[PDB]
Design a protein around this ligand. Structure first.
Ligand SMILES: [Zn+2]
Ligand SMILES: [Zn+2]
Lengths: 49, 49, 65, 49, 94, 188, 48
DNA sequence: GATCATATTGTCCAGACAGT
DNA sequence: ACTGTCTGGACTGGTCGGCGCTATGATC
């Protein structure tokens, strides 16, 4: 692969419906979302995302 | 292989260029300081290019 | 880079009929029938003619003097 | 040599064979006397020297 | 063609044949086999590189005739057979 | 519809090999480094502050020129990989960086200077063989079947071998049975 | 002690003195790479 | 433009050792 | 007297050939 800017990918992930990690804390029923090995947020339905 | 990343020629070239540019920056700073201390302030600011 | 003069096995001369074989193969003819029509019977001579790749023209373009 | 028929049917075919760069012309080395190392006064190392 | 005698017993003759190879040696040995007075007839190449053109022979007879005479008759038989084959080939070609 | 035969998949595979090639990782990595890697390094260095009161030099844009060599006499001529190989030269291109002097907090007119020569990867976007046909490569003494992707340093071909390292900034957990401990390691 | 050399690119004949050459280049096309031409004397090569 | 001092200070096995 | 910890060390032989590397800043 050839690298791409991470800011655009993070913005796209936030727009698609990923709740930011600062807004909502992780929960046992929550799906952790990682971007390049960095925890960026959580979503309720990981499979749908 | 999900935990493995390949360091291609671009990354190694970037690291080498960073080291060389740091050495060049240090040499340029030393040369500018020496020239200012030796020739004086009048010669330095009469032509900054 | 050029077609051998004789077959490496029995010494049968094949370089004379190589260019006709290449011309007929590129025209869509069956290489086996072309080899049969040229007198190439033993498969060692067929090995020599079929497996040869011409490369001298790619070497002539570079001058050494 | 004998001209007689072999008692067994011999398997013969066309196999792609490659000649490698490991040639005996570049590998034969013979030393009787010659140059020695300055430090140890012992024979040198390598066929080139 | 040079003959170098290795050893000579009362009925055994061992010799070299410089300048020859398997072609003449095998024919000479198998022609000597046709003689009923020859008990042992054989040849070998000591080394395919150093002795490539120098086979070693060994002819043993029963004492009725000498090994040299047996070799001479074998060579004469080879000569006559080759002449007959040449005549037949010349007749068949025309 | 009948299922696809392996011949059609082979045709698709051959199309992939014809489009990208076999040295794509070297060329893509070098192109990415040329496009923004030098600028990223320059920006991360930022500026140089000498021991002069109210004076500093700010680094601007950085650009790479065409591969050329300066003769000992003084003439400047274009450089080609065959000439570099024959004459034991390094196939490199000059690097130009814009420097903006700052006096008393006010930026002056920028000056563009040469900061060095950067070796050029063969058949890369900064190479003179990029976009050339087979006949043009032949006219320059280059084999059309040469894939490129290497460097010529003092007339010797140098190829960078990729390193299979661990993922940066990634934490991996492992258990040491001999020491009886749980250890997680990250490379930052 | 002058000598005749052949250019690598243009191929035309170049004459210059190696002992007292300020620059080794072809005066016709500017190429700095030259080829020493083969001598016209005969040589014996064994046929395999 | 030529010279001259100076140039920085990779796991595992076995033996010795503080700690309890 | 045991027990975990710090430190030192050695890392199979030969052969082939290649490819770099062995100064620099400041007067006079
Ligand atoms: Zn044949
Ligand atoms: Zn010329």
């Amino acid at each position: 692969t050839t690298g791409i800017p991470e800011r655009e990918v993070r913005e796209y992930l936030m727009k698609m419906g990923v709740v930011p990690i600062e807004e909502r804390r992780p929960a046992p029923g929550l799906y952790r979302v990682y971007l390049n090995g960095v925890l960026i947020g959580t979503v309720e339905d990981g499979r749908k995302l | 292989y999900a935990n493995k990343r390949l360091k291609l020629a671009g990354d190694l070239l970037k690291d080498l260029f960073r080291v060389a540019f740091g050495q060049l920056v240090k040499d340029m700073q030393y040369q500018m300081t020496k020239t200012y201390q030796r020739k004086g302030e009048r010669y330095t600011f009469e032509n900054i290019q | 880079m050029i077609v051998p003069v004789r077959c490496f096995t029995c010494g049968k001369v094949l370089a004379d009929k190589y260019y006709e074989f290449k011309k007929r193969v590129e025209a869509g003819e069956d290489p086996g029938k072309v080899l049969d029509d040229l007198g190439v019977e033993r498969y060692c001579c067929r090995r020599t003619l079929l497996s040869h790749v011409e490369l001298i023209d790619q070497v002539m373009v570079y001058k050494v003097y | 040599i004998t001209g007689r028929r072999l008692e067994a049917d011999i398997f013969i075919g066309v196999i792609y064979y490659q000649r490698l760069h490991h040639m005996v012309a570049d590998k034969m080395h013979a030393r009787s006397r010659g140059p020695v190392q300055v430090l140890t006064k012992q024979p040198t190392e390598g066929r080139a020297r | 063609m040079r003959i170098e005698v290795i050893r000579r017993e009362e009925n055994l003759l061992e010799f070299y044949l410089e300048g020859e190879d398997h072609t003449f040696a095998n024919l000479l040995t198998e022609t000597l086999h046709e003689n009923e007075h020859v008990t042992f007839a054989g040849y070998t190449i000591e080394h395919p590189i150093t002795m490539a053109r120098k086979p070693r022979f060994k002819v043993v007879t029963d004492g009725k005739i000498t090994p040299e005479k047996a070799l001479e008759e074998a060579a004469q038989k080879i000569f006559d057979r080759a002449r007959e084959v040449l005549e037949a080939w010349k007749a068949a070609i025309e | 519809e009948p299922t696809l035969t392996p011949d059609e998949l082979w045709l698709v595979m051959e199309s992939y090999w014809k489009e990208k090639g076999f040295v794509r990782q070297h060329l893509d990595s070098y192109n990415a480094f040329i496009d923004h890697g030098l600028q990223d390094v320059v920006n991360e260095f930022g500026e140089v502050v000498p021991d002069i009161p109210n004076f500093k030099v700010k680094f601007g844009k950085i650009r790479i020129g065409q591969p050329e060599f300066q003769e000992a006499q003084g003439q400047r001529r274009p450089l080609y990989p065959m000439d570099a190989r024959i004459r034991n030269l390094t196939y490199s291109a000059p690097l130009y960086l814009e420097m903006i002097p700052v006096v008393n907090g006010i930026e002056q007119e920028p000056v563009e200077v040469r900061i060095g020569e950067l070796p050029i990867m063969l058949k890369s976007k900064a190479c003179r063989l990029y976009g050339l046909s087979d006949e043009e490569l032949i006219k320059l003494g280059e084999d059309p079947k040469d894939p490129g992707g290497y460097f010529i340093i003092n007339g010797s071909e140098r190829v960078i071998v990729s390193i299979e390292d661990l993922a940066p900034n990634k934490t991996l957990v492992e258990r040491d049975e001999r020491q009886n401990k749980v250890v997680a390691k990250v490379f930052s | 002690a002058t000598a005749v050399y052949r250019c690598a690119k243009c191929g035309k004949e170049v004459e210059l003195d190696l002992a007292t050459a300020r620059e080794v280049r072809c005066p016709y096309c500017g190429s700095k790479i030259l080829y020493k031409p083969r001598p016209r004397v005969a040589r014996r090569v064994k046929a395999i």
